[PDB]
């Protein structure tokens, strides 16, 4: 039952590989083209298999793939890189349900993976966006069953509608039904409306309003 905690800041990719090799016991033949700096933040202690899933996520994020050439593992390249890889512990919600809601926040250059054995998320992004995503995970974690409504936007811009709907859930501009959540999927220009059933039905209509 060995649990490890990987914490790095601008550490060499080759040092991260040496640490993975120390944990896993697996020996890697690093290609010379494999170079760069990695930042890792472990909010959770991880199992060896969980550590291996982290390794793959870091490798995928920086443009490297693992090749098993005759029972011998080899890291080879693919075809902002000051990206952070965080291991976030989800407490009350099953991680798998959570990914559909978090994927819209992770960019194309980013990475998002589930570690169900540890009920944790591996996300690679910019540090400032990771802080935002963890604030989303925290808000989500509370609710029991994440039933949502999806609104595909025709005239409006998702990020405009999302900021508007969330700002309207306050004092100067009120919604009328709070405890609801807006998650913006830029890739498909759609809003994922969450929260209590009564609250969620109100927020849907407010997004429609803008679709005129």
């Amino acid at each position: 039952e060995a649990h490890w905690t990987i914490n790095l800041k601008d550490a060499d990719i080759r040092e991260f590989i040496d640490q993975i090799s120390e944990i896993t016991g697996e020996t890697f033949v690093v290609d010379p083209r494999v170079k760069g700096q990695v930042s890792v933040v472990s909010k959770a202690q991880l199992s060896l298999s969980e550590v291996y899933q982290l390794f793959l996520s870091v490798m995928s994020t920086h443009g490297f793939t693992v090749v098993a050439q005759g029972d011998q593992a080899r890291i080879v390249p693919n075809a902002p890189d000051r990206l952070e890889t965080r291991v976030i512990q989800v407490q009350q919600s099953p991680v798998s349900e959570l990914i559909p809601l978090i994927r819209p926040l992770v960019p194309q250059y980013g990475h998002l993976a589930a570690v169900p054995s540890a009920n944790a998320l591996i996300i690679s992004d910019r540090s400032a966006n990771i802080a935002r995503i963890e604030d989303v995970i925290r808000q989500l974690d509370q609710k029991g069953s994440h039933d949502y409504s999806v609104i595909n936007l025709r005239y409006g811009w998702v990020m405009d509608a999302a900021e508007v709907l969330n700002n309207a859930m306050s004092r100067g501009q009120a919604k009328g039904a709070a405890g609801a959540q807006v998650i913006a999927d830029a890739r498909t220009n759609r809003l994922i409306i969450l929260g209590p059933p009564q609250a969620r039905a109100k927020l849907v209509q407010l997004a429609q309003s803008l679709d005129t």
């Epitope: 649990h3 472990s42 909010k43």
Partner: nanobody, 125 residues
Framework: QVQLVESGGGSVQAGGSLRLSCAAS????????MGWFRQGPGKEREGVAS????????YYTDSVKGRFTISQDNAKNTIYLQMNSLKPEDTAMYFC??????????????????WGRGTQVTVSS
Amino acid sequence: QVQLVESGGGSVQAGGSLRLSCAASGNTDSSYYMGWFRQGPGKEREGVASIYIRAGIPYYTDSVKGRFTISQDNAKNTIYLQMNSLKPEDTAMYFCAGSVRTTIQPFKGNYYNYWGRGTQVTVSS
């Protein structure tokens, strides 16, 4: 070259509480983790809590989670262990150790470098 001093130990009844303290002498800038370990008579040395100094990231063993809380004060250069709902199993000589390694197993002493002397914690029936 960073010495560590422990205080806060004592004799308490079951369901009680103690606040253990661990003062660092030099600068924690060359040490990533500061953890708490305990040894019981006829029991092997085991880690209980650990904190990544730079970001204040806490780690706990299942047997201590939801009872104990590892905290820090970088200004006062001390790390704390707020021990609550204390069971008689918790009776042991508590040690506080520093780690100069970036990635370790936060509950295994081999990964740590400086160690303290200790504080006796006794929980009775």
